[PDB]
Enzyme design. Structure first.
Site, PDB file in Angstrom:
ATOM      1  N   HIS A  38       3.093  11.040   6.836  1.00 19.32           N
ATOM      2  CA  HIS A  38       2.391  10.737   8.093  1.00 19.32           C
ATOM      3  C   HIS A  38       3.382  10.150   9.014  1.00 19.32           C
ATOM      4  CE1 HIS A  38      -1.696  10.563   5.913  1.00 19.32           C
ATOM      5  NE2 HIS A  38      -1.303  11.811   6.179  1.00 19.32           N
TER       6      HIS A  38
ATOM      7  N   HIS B 130       0.852  -1.234   0.000  1.00 18.94           N
ATOM      8  CA  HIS B 130       0.000   0.000   0.000  1.00 18.94           C
ATOM      9  C   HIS B 130       0.861   1.247   0.000  1.00 18.94           C
ATOM     10  CE1 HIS B 130      -2.643  -3.149   1.975  1.00 18.94           C
ATOM     11  NE2 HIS B 130      -3.290  -2.830   0.863  1.00 18.94           N
TER      12      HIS B 130
ATOM     13  N   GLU C  84      -3.616  13.584   1.000  1.00 23.75           N
ATOM     14  CA  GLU C  84      -4.906  13.119   1.578  1.00 23.75           C
ATOM     15  C   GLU C  84      -5.673  14.296   2.176  1.00 23.75           C
ATOM     16  OE1 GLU C  84      -3.895   9.538   3.974  1.00 23.75           O
ATOM     17  OE2 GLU C  84      -4.747   8.700   2.221  1.00 23.75           O
TER      18      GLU C  84
END
Ligand SMILES: Cc1cc[nH]c(=S)c1
Ligand SMILES: [Zn+2]
EC number: 4.2.1.1
Length: 257
Positions: A116, A61, A103
């Site tokens: 992140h 991912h 995002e």
């Protein structure tokens, strides 16, 4: 299983993870005119002097740079937080084109990517217990814009060839995450969630206002990773971002005037 394609991407996640349509999902658009300055917010304390990186992993991912979180070595505190949150990993989300990838958005603006830094509340003892709590995680989000290279990112870009496919990992010791920070720690904060399944609602989001600049070659290299495993048809790891979700009954607070 879930992913980012037409058939298993964000529009589908709710069928296996119903909290996808919950009350505190992430990411969101940050409307800068609607976010109110909160003069009771404290400066953020980012204490990474003692960070111990271990490994970088392509998980199918994204890639995760993992840290030793068995002691208070790299912690985030202050800001909107009560208590001490330990860095466990960082990762990015990014686009197939420089105009998309983040995002969170700021006044609907998408950045080329978003970093992140994930931390868990030490009062819960371990990460898996912390993700069962509404104040279990604190994620520091930092936007990437394409311009000049970010020198502190280059050791991450250099190693991606060695973890091209899902399930590959490589040693990644002695990496200093302080080199990924912008100059200012001015931020917006709001309660939200993980942005990939299981989409748990445990996150205090702290999104820095100042983006870091990376070069077009740095982000090109991110786009050469693969979602697939070795020996499988090549699927470029690009557009691994979830779009903005409804704000619902939340206020975004600004640390700055
Ligand atoms: C803990 C975690 C894991 C994957 N992605 C995010 S934003 C956060
Ligand atoms: Zn993330």
């Amino acid at each position: 299983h879930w992913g980012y394609g037409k058939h298993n991407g964000p529009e589908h996640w709710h069928k296996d993870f119903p909290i996808a349509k919950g009350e505190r999902q992430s990411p969101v658009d940050i409307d800068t005119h609607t976010a109110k300055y909160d003069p009771s917010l404290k400066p953020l304390s980012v204490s990474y002097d003692q960070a111990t990186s271990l490994r970088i992993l392509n998980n199918g991912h994204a890639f995760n740079v993992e840290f030793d979180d068995s002691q208070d070595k790299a912690v985030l505190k202050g800001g909107p937080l009560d208590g001490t949150y330990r860095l466990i990993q960082f990762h990015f989300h990014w686009g197939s084109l420089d105009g998309q990838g983040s995002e969170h958005t700021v006044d609907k603006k998408k950045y080329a990517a978003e970093l992140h830094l994930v931390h868990w509340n030490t009062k819960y003892g371990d990460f898996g217990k912390a993700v069962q709590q509404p104040d279990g995680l604190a994620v520091l989000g930092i936007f990437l814009k394409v311009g000049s290279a970010k020198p502190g990112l280059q050791k991450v870009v250099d190693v991606l060839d060695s973890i091209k496919t899902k399930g590959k990992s490589a040693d990644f010791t002695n990496f200093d995450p302080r080199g990924l920070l912008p100059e200012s720690l001015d931020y917006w904060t709001y309660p939200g969630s993980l942005t990939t399944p299981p989409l748990l609602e445990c996150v205090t989001w702290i999104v820095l206002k100042e983006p870091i600049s990376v070069s077009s070659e740095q982000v090109l290299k991110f786009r050469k990773l693969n979602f697939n495993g070795e020996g499988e048809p090549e699927e470029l790891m690009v557009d691994n971002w979830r779009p903005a979700q409804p704000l619902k009954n939340r206020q975004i607070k600004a640390s700055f005037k």
